[PDB]
Design a protein around this ligand. Sequence first.
Ligand SMILES: Nc1ncnc2c1ncn2[C@@H]1O[C@H](COP(=O)(O)OP(=O)(O)OP(=O)(O)O)[C@@H](O)[C@H]1O
Ligand SMILES: Nc1ncnc2c1ncn2[C@@H]1O[C@H](COP(=O)(O)OP(=O)(O)OP(=O)(O)O)[C@@H](O)[C@H]1O
Length: 464
Amino acid sequence: NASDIKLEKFSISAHGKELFVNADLYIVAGRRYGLVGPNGKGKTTLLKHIANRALSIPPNIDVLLCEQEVVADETPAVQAVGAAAAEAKARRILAGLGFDPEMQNRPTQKFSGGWRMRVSLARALFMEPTLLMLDEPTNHLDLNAVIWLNNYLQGWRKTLLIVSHDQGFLDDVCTDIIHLDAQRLHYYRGNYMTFKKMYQQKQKELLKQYEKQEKKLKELKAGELLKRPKEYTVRFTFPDPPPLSPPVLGLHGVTFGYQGQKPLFKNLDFGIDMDSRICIVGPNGVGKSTLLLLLTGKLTPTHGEMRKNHRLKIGFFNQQYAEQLRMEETPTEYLQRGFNLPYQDARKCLGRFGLESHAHTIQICKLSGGQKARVVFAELACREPDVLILDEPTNNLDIESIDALGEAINEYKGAVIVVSHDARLITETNCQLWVVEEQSVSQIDGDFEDYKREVLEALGEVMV
Ligand SMILES: Nc1ncnc2c1ncn2[C@@H]1O[C@H](COP(=O)(O)OP(=O)(O)OP(=O)(O)O)[C@@H](O)[C@H]1O
Ligand SMILES: Nc1ncnc2c1ncn2[C@@H]1O[C@H](COP(=O)(O)OP(=O)(O)OP(=O)(O)O)[C@@H](O)[C@H]1O
């Protein structure tokens, strides 16, 4: 039938880096593996070397997914290549990923990059290969697409290899976890929950064995070798705001659109309290980021107005601001000059948001996207905000920092408005869901599972 992959003590060096030293690749046919590990450690390189067959791989049909070309070809046609059944399947996969009939029959040239990535995703799902490899497939999808993709991949019967830092996705889809650590692959049977249990237990026991080793060495001296394990203590805690008299923040009769385009919102009324937990949902391109920018005041309404308490302090996150910052300063200098922080305070703040010590003295322009995002979260902490407004906060974070962010949101005594595709984050923070639709915002009275069933019921899909 189908062969397994067992490549033992292979090594991969790429871009002048020793990414894999004597690693073992075990991929059993039919199982679903999630590949997790820190940024820049060689996950994408491993997938590319498997697809290339640069590593000795048996002749199984293997597909690695990447962005699809832009031409006059209609989207279901780039999927497609009896025929009625195949076209219906392609259109079902496309609708699940957020394609309405028009977008379906739309030429692939009139789509942005992310939508072309979705088109390619539909392709590899349609082809149904023996071994399908997905590189962070939910990272740039919206919540509706992630809901559908999770539900779809649970019924997948062939072999999957998925790189991801989407914890709920990994928990719902994967039967095995592969951890890229110390240039090697470590295997865990079960989803991410099982992996984190086993890994934290391994680290506790390594610490105890190191301590007993050093105690016995001291005893020998008074009368191969192990190293001390490494800590990784992220704490995303935000300071709790003092009491604030209403009104807090609201849009009143707000109409907004961009020049020469049909307005994205008409006669919009939407307000928050100091305990609000709001998750803005809707397919990409509907205006979620625009709504957040209207809530911050960085976009001015065409009609109506935004009103907030004149003492309200907003902490705002989005990826484009992370590329803004103050590029020639170090993160330490950035925090100290922005908020008159003593050096030790800036250091502890940068450290607890996940910025390693060696990066505190690098110019911000030389930092990676994840490092810049962590600097922005630290800045938000220093701003002492009353309202957190987070547009896709998890895109450049690891799972441990996303868990820390969820815990911090649950401890935070201010308001939080978030746009996110991370189901675990949206769920654990008890977010009330508000969908952008009808040039307005509509409340989903119900929990996240109600919205998930609603999304799948609109598509004629059976929730597993
Ligand atoms: N085109 C390139 N040129 C130079 N260096 C690269 C290139 N691609 C990757 N690298 C380096 O190789 C290392 C591993 O890259 P890779 O992208 O495989 O890691 P990854 O973060 O696990 O992958 P991904 O984030 O794409 O899932 C990183 O240090 C990265 O900077
Ligand atoms: N500066 C701009 N000028 C003209 N049109 C814009 C501009 N910014 C966004 N748009 C358009 O407005 C529509 C909605 O944009 P927006 O990014 O707010 O929605 P979104 O995809 O839900 O948010 P996100 O960017 O967080 O995914 C899109 O069709 C987009 O092309």
